[PDB]
Design a protein around this ligand. Sequence first.
Ligand SMILES: Cc1cc2nc3c(=O)[nH]c(=O)nc-3n(C[C@H](O)[C@H](O)[C@H](O)COP(=O)(O)OP(=O)(O)OC[C@H]3O[C@@H](n4cnc5c(N)ncnc54)[C@H](O)[C@@H]3O)c2cc1C
Ligand SMILES: Cc1cc2nc3c(=O)[nH]c(=O)nc-3n(C[C@H](O)[C@H](O)[C@H](O)COP(=O)(O)OP(=O)(O)OC[C@H]3O[C@@H](n4cnc5c(N)ncnc54)[C@H](O)[C@@H]3O)c2cc1C
Lengths: 461, 461
Amino acid sequence: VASYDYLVIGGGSGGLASARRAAELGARAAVVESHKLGGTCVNVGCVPKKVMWNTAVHSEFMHDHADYGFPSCEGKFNWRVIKEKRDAYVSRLNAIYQNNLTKSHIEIIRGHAAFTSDPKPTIEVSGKKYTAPHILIATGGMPSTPHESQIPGASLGITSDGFFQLEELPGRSVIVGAGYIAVEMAGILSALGSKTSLMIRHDKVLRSFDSMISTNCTEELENAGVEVLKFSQVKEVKKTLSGLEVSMVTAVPGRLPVMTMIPDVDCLLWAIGRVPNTKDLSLNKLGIQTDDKGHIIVDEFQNTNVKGIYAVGDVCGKALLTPVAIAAGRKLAHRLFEYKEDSKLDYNNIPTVVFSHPPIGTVGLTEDEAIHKYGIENVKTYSTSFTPMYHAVTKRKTKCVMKMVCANKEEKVVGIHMQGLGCDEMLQGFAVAVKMGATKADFDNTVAIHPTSSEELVTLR
Amino acid sequence: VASYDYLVIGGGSGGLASARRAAELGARAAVVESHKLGGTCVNVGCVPKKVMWNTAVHSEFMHDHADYGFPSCEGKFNWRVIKEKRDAYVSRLNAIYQNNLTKSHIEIIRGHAAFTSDPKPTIEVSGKKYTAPHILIATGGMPSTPHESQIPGASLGITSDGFFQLEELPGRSVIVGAGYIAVEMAGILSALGSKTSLMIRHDKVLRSFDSMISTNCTEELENAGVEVLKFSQVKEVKKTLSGLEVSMVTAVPGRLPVMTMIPDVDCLLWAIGRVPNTKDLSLNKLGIQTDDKGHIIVDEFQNTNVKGIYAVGDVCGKALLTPVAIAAGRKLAHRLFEYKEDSKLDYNNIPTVVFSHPPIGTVGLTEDEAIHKYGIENVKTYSTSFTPMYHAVTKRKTKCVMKMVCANKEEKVVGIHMQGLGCDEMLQGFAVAVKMGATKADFDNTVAIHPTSSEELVTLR
Ligand SMILES: Cc1cc2nc3c(=O)[nH]c(=O)nc-3n(C[C@H](O)[C@H](O)[C@H](O)COP(=O)(O)OP(=O)(O)OC[C@H]3O[C@@H](n4cnc5c(N)ncnc54)[C@H](O)[C@@H]3O)c2cc1C
Ligand SMILES: Cc1cc2nc3c(=O)[nH]c(=O)nc-3n(C[C@H](O)[C@H](O)[C@H](O)COP(=O)(O)OP(=O)(O)OC[C@H]3O[C@@H](n4cnc5c(N)ncnc54)[C@H](O)[C@@H]3O)c2cc1C
């Protein structure tokens, strides 16, 4: 039984981040990974997605070429040209991450880990046993898919994982789901040329975001050529002579339901949710607490109900973002190996960017959350809607919407929500400001940068 | 002699901003303008420049089309197509600004204003006299040009004003100057297809910016095809049979000077400086203080040496930016008509974006200024240099450089400097943070947004 100071299960965003900071602090650490280092983000997440988003953005701007005095671009997009370059980039990143580990003297145990029946917390990878006074579970999650029992022919559709395996652009695609992953996929496919439909259970996408955003995003999707099928869901899917045939039910409130068949579908993409990767961990062997979805339960310090065992990242089911897994993993390493018992991550004011077209940026409370926390009487919001200067000379147009949520008489900025060109790189700084507890006065007393879209946020009235 | 509560001379950024805020406070105001409302920024500055920058950005991205799986774009840029659309946009803005004035009940006195010999401060516009207890001078400035006496044939070149009158793309252009206007002009002309040369007196451009920026910007200019002629200056210009012939002297330190002739130049653009517009104001009639450049001297409250007379904007020669003129103008209106005697603009931490390729963003002190203000021992800087993810799949590359200047043990962020894709919309928020007095810890405790370039600033080490 080989012993280490720190055993990290899962070589993804949180695991690697935690292991590397620990090693820096003098801990003898080891990382267990059954697949490719970098985890979900690097291999089938953030990275390949951003590359594809940059590709879609190229398509959109190509539509404006003539408006800007250039000759019209004619071409059909060649998917496998970009797919190959994308795959290669991911390969380079994998090699880099391995190198980072070796340089830090972190041992890499290749294989699938599971807890043993042994008294003191111990795991087994390929017959060999390993243990440590501190063990971190950062196994992440996977795409959720419907059961054939509930939706016949469900296994005929793909998930976001399959999306990155596609070698050709699907002629016709149907995406099911209304979360950020669904929105992003629909946006990329549509911009690249696929006749795309997005099937959502209600009337708007991203319903957990501020109402101004969900409303605006749904509209922009439609303006971009995406067919948004509201109040609908798949009843069954079947393989026809040429492609799939999707049977769906549309039940608009105050109306009679109606069944519809969508034929000649080349790609059915399920983007309905994520499930934690805890099934084959043998967590029961140690009695580690989980909820009914399989998420590991942790306190504010990432502690599980068992001493010496922690969890961070997607596996805990809260704030499923790479930077959050990373920050939580680092804060943990500092608390354990630098003995800063107050070291933990504040899950409030975590910023998010959704790579739609245009992109969405958000941080803090939505107007509704602020109203429930401070009371309608104490919440004031400021907002604006304009057409970015970039479209002053184009026939095609997109909008830019911004909303600031303030609380109390001091007008503390508790939330910022926006969608528009450049909003993806615009958010970070304001997020710092909001984390610092800025008030509207602080924003107002900052000289604007002109001409930009960002200056609108410091000149709201 | 018609009397008002507030008389504003100049209908540009600062003048209009001040007049409108004053009216809001109940003041009976009037604005004197001899030309087009909107001033320099709207008519021959920020606006038309940004439109042209967006056009140049289109050209750059078109070079990457093939790399992103699209068929190569072939076309020659058609200048007058964009010039006409640009002119029209400026026309719309002019109409809008006039409307804004009327709606606020601000009187517009068309004509050139000058102070009279009259005791109490009075001005005359087209024979009629006007007065007020408070008069604001916001006449801005104009492009500086060499005297024929010093540089023969100087009048053969154009200024930034002339640049916006160009109806065709110059085949060969030479820009003289090393400030932001020169850099921007060179960048646009070069990207649009003109064989461009930038003539600078020393070895780098933007020498008043942080050394990392001036160095990087000079390199990027060269990588973009701009011929940077260092340690050179024009000796004389003459009109030949086809275009201009520029005679220049290149005096590299530690070398013998050498004269060179640049033939077939279609456009010689002087971007050497700006002179204040105070010459025909008859300021002497009231003994208003100015420096030897013609700039009106003011205290921290925009007061001139004469009671009841103020000045803001480019005419005062400090921080020549539209947002600064606007903020100073508004702060003044609040002090005068809302009686907030402490109302004034803080000229520290004013953010600036230079629309180069890639764009530059800066706010606060450069490393050298921080060292002179706090001492080498108390100044710490953090920086990084990387290739934006957007170029992971392109043959063409640009870099992204970022530098954070911290002071004292607390590591207060006193300066942020960067250049790279997206930096134009990235700065505003960090500027708010810096204005609030953030420390490196505040930046470090803000969760990153991934994948973006902006996340690099909150993960510096
Ligand atoms: C399509 C999509 C796009 C996304 N885009 C973004 C974005 O753009 N920005 C963002 O911030 N987030 C994004 N996310 C979410 C981000 O990918 C995850 O939040 C992040 O990867 C979670 O980090 P993790 O450490 O918790 O898990 P993971 O990264 O998933 O790593 C878990 C690792 O554990 C390994 N593992 C599992 N079980 C064990 C075992 N029993 N033993 C050994 N190894 C094992 C898996 O192989 C894997 O590598 C994206 C998610 C996806 C699916
Ligand atoms: C090429 C260039 C690009 C620039 N790009 C930017 C940028 O991108 N962002 C930025 O922030 N800044 C930019 N600037 C600087 C910005 O244009 C000025 O900082 C800003 O216009 C100054 O405001 P002002 O109120 O002081 O003067 P102005 O805008 O110049 O207005 C002065 C007004 O006074 C009028 N006037 C003058 N004399 C009198 C008189 N005797 N009576 C009656 N009317 C009269 C003039 O007609 C004019 O309209 C740019 C400058 C230029 C030249």
